[PDB]
Ligand binder design. Structure first.
Ligand code: 4QM
Ligand code: 4QM
Lengths: 36, 513, 50, 50
C-alpha cells in the first residue's frame, strides 16, 4: 500500500498540521458527570 | 587526568566498580557515571548540579536582607512613583469627561453609587462639585486664562480617589491613543526617510516646534532636494497621516511635545515603582521558600509551591502600606499561604475537585481522626453525619469520591513484570458473531422484502431506513408516489400484516429470539 | 438499526431496558452448592433469603 | 478508564502532560505581571525540565 517509510524532523507548521486543536487546560474529565 | 586513569583501567578490564569510578572521579556524579558508560568514545573521553532547585537557591543567594527601616524607604519610593503618574495623567482632558459620563450613567441606575468610586480624600456632593468645575472650565478654553482654569480643575480633581479598575482603564485608553499617534508618526518617518533618505535634521527643523500644520511636510516638497521630489509618490499616505494627526490634535488639546514629556515622566515613575517592587520581592523570596515547606507531599513539587508563593508575594508587595506597621512577615505570610493552598486545590489531582469540596473532604478527615482517637475503634457514616451535621447522604457521596487513579503501570503480574494495563479489556468492541448476525439479518430482510408487490417494498424501505440514506415520513413518500399520507399508511399496514403470519416470515422469527 | 426496527415493527416486541449481568457457573465445572451467605449494606431491605 | 467501583486507572502520560501544561500556563500568566527576571528564569528552567 505504501512500500516505503520515511523519517525526518517535524517543523512547527507540520505539528500544527497534524493537530485538530490546541490543549489549553490541564483538566481531564468532570468529577461528577464523568464527561470530557 | 583523573578520568583518563579510570578510562585506562576500564579499557584494560572492560568493566569497572562503583567504588573505583567514584574515587577516581549527586546529579553531577550521575552525569559522570552516564558519560563513563558511553564507551562501555572521543566525545565522552574529552567530556552545574543541573538541579532546578539548587540553581534557584544559588541565584537567590546573591541578595541582601532588609531590616525594619530597609522597607520604609522602598515603600515611600513606590508612593512617589504612583503619585508621579497621577500628576502625569491629571492633565489628560478626556479622562474627566469619561468620569463624568460614567457617573451620569451610574446616576441612571446602571450601577451602584459606591462601586464607581472608593470614596474621596458626600459622594453625590463631591460629584456635583466636580460637574460644576468641569462645566465652568470646559467653556473657558480661551488660551490666556484657560491654563490656570485647567490647572485648578486638575487640582480639584486630585482630591478624588478612583477605583483601580477604571483608573487602569483610563491609563490604557491614554496608552492606546499615544500608540496610535506614535504609529502614525512612525509610518510617516518610514515613508519619508527610508523611501527618500530624508535627513533627520530637516525633520527636527520642520516637524518639531509646531507638529500640527502641514507646512512641515507639504511646504517642504519644494525645497529643491531629491527627497522632496521623491515625497511626491508617497504624498498620499503622508497626507492621510497628517490629517489623522490634525484630527487627534483636537482631542489632545495640547502640544505633542508636552505629551511626550508627560509619558517620559510616567515611564520613569513606573520604572521606579518596578525597581522598588523587585528589590522588595528579591528579599522576600527567602520568606516565600520558608513558608512553602509545609506542603511537600501534597501532589505538587516543591518548586511549583515556591513559584505559587512567589505570585502571592508579588501581589502583597503591591497591596502593602507602611501606615499599619505590620512587619511584612505578617501581611505577607497570609497571601503566600492563600496562594499555595488554592494552587494545591486547583492543580494537585488529575480529576479536579472544586475548592469547597476539598474543604469538605479535609473537614471530614479531621473529624474522622478525632473520632477514631476518642472512641477508639472507628467512626461510621451515621456517626460521622451525627458529628458533622450532614444528611448522611452527602457524607456517603463525599466518601465515594474516586480517590486518586491507579497508575496503569503498577507491576501486578509479579511473574513476568506484567502491568495493570494489560488486563483491562475493551468493552465497546462488537463481537464478531454479532456482526455476522447483523449481516445475516440484512440478507434475510432483503430476501423477504422481495416477496411482495414493488409498491409495498418501496414504501417499507422508505419508512424504515432500509438501505436508504435516511428515514422518511408519510408525506415525503407521498410526494414520491403522488398520494397523500393515507393510502401510504394503509399499504404499510397491509404489508406488515402480510409479513406477520408464518410461511412468509419464519427465519425472521429465528432472528427475533 | 434500520431492519431491526422493521423486525420489531413486524413482530411487535419491546425493548428489554435491563441487561443480564447474572452470576453463572463457569464453563466445564459441575458441582453442588454447599453454602450461600449474603452481605448487605447497613441501609437496605434484607431480601427474604438474607 | 473506570475500574469496578469508583476507582480509575490512568497512564503516566496524563500526569506529564498536566505538568507541562500547568507550567506553560503559569509562565504565560507570569509574563503579563512583569515579574522580576529571577522568577521568569526559574519558570523557564522548570518548563524545560518538565
Ligand atoms: C503488587 C500488586 C499490587 C496490586 C495487586 C494491588 C495494589 C492496589 C490494588 C488495587 C487498588 O486497591 C485499587 C482497587 C481497589 C479495589 O477494591 C480492587 C481493585 C483495585 C485495582 C485494587 C486490585 C489489587 O489488589 C491492587 C491493584
Ligand atoms: C495475581 C494477579 C492478580 C490478577 C489476576 C487480578 C488481581 C486484581 C485483578 C484486577 C483488579 O481487580 C482491578 C481490575 C478489576 C476489573 O474488574 C477487571 C480488571 C482488573 C485489572 C482486574 C483483572 C485481574 O483479575 C486482576 C489484575
Amino acid at each position: 500500500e505504501f512500500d516505503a517509510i520515511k523519517i525526518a524532523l517535524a517543523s512547527p507548521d507540520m505539528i500544527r498540521s497534524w493537530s485538530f486543536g490546541e490543549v489549553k487546560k490541564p483538566e481531564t474529565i468532570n468529577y461528577r458527570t464523568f464527561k470530557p | 587526568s583523573q578520568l583518563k586513569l579510570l578510562v585506562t583501567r576500564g579499557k584494560e578490564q572492560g568493566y569497572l566498580t562503583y567504588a573505583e569510578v567514584n574515587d577516581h572521579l549527586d546529579a553531577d556524579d550521575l552525569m559522570l557515571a552516564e558519560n563513563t558508560a558511553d564507551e562501555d568514545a572521543a566525545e565522552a573521553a574529552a567530556q552545574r548540579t543541573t538541579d532546578p532547585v539548587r540553581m534557584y537557591m544559588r541565584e537567590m543567594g546573591t541578595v541582601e536582607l532588609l531590616t525594619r527601616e530597609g522597607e520604609i524607604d522602598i515603600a515611600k519610593r513606590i508612593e512617589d512613583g504612583i503619585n508621579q503618574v497621577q500628576c502625569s495623567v491629571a492633565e489628560y482632558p478626556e479622562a474627566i469627561t469619561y468620569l463624568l459620563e460614567q457617573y451620569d450613567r451610574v446616576e441612571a441606575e446602571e450601577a451602584r453609587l459606591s462601586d464607581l468610586i472608593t470614596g474621596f480624600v458626600l459622594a453625590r456632593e463631591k460629584f456635583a462639585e466636580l460637574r460644576a468645575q468641569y462645566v465652568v472650565t470646559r467653556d473657558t478654553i480661551k488660551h490666556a486664562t484657560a491654563q490656570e482654569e485647567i490647572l485648578k480643575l486638575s487640582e480639584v480633581f486630585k482630591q478624588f480617589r478612583l477605583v483601580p479598575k477604571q483608573f487602569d482603564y483610563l491609563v490604557n485608553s491614554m496608552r492606546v491613543m499615544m500608540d496610535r499617534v506614535r504609529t502614525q508618526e512612525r509610518l510617516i518617518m518610514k515613508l519619508c526617510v527610508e523611501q527618500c533618505k530624508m535627513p533627520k535634521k530637516n525633520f527636527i527643523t520642520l516637524f518639531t516646534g509646531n507638529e500640527t500644520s502641514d507646512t512641515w511636510f507639504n511646504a517642504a516638497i519644494a525645497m529643491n532636494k531629491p527627497w522632496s521630489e521623491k515625497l511626491h509618490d508617497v504624498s498620499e499616505e503622508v497626507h492621510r497621516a497628517l490629517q489623522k494627526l490634525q484630527q487627534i490634535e483636537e482631542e489632545t488639546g495640547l502640544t505633542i511635545e508636552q505629551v511626550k514629556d508627560i509619558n517620559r515622566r510616567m515611564s520613569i515613575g513606573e520604572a521606579k515603582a518596578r525597581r522598588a517592587k523587585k528589590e522588595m520581592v528579591e528579599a522576600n523570596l527567602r520568606l516565600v521558600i520558608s513558608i512553602a515547606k509545609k506542603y511537600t507531599n501534597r501532589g505538587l513539587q516543591f518548586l511549583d509551591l515556591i513559584q505559587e508563593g512567589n505570585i502571592g508575594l508579588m501581589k502583597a508587595v503591591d497591596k502593602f502600606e507602611y501606615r499599619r506597621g505590620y512587619k511584612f512577615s505578617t501581611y505577607a505570610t497570609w497571601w503566600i499561604r492563600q496562594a499555595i493552598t488554592r494552587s494545591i486545590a486547583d492543580q494537585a489531582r488529575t480529576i479536579r475537585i472544586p475548592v469547597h469540596m476539598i474543604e469538605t473532604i479535609n473537614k471530614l478527615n479531621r473529624i474522622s481522626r478525632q473520632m477514631l482517637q476518642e472512641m477508639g475503634r472507628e467512626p461510621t457514616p451515621e456517626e460521622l453525619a451525627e458529628r458533622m451535621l450532614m444528611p448522611e447522604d452527602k457524607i456517603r457521596k463525599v466518601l465515594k469520591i474516586a480517590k486518586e487513579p491507579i497508575s496503569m503501570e503498577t507491576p501486578i503480574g509479579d511473574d513476568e513484570d506484567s502491568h495493570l494495563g494489560d488486563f483491562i479489556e475493551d468493552t465497546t468492541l462488537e463481537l464478531p458473531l454479532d456482526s455476522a448476525t447483523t449481516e445475516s439479518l440484512r440478507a434475510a430482510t432483503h430476501d423477504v422484502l422481495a416477496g411482495l408487490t414493488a409498491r409495498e417494498a418501496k414504501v417499507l424501505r422508505m419508512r424504515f431506513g432500509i438501505d436508504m440514506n435516511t428515514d422518511y415520513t408519510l408525506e415525503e413518500v407521498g410526494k414520491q408516489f403522488d398520494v397523500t399520507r393515507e393510502r401510504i399508511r394503509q399499504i404499510e399496514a397491509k404489508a406488515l400484516r402480510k409479513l406477520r403470519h408464518p410461511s412468509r416470515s419464519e427465519v425472521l422469527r429465528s432472528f427475533l429470539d | 438499526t434500520p431492519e431491526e426496527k422493521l423486525l420489531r415493527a413486524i413482530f411487535g416486541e419491546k425493548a428489554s431496558d435491563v441487561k443480564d449481568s447474572s452470576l453463572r457457573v463457569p464453563n466445564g465445572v459441575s458441582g453442588t452448592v454447599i453454602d450461600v451467605q449474603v452481605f448487605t449494606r447497613d441501609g437496605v431491605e434484607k431480601d427474604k433469603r438474607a | 478508564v473506570p475500574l469496578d467501583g469508583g476507582r480509575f486507572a490512568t497512564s503516566d502520560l496524563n500526569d506529564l502532560y498536566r505538568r507541562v501544561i500547568n507550567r506553560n500556563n503559569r509562565l504565560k500568566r507570569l509574563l503579563d505581571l512583569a515579574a522580576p527576571d529571577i522568577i521568569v528564569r526559574n519558570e523557564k528552567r522548570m518548563l524545560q525540565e518538565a
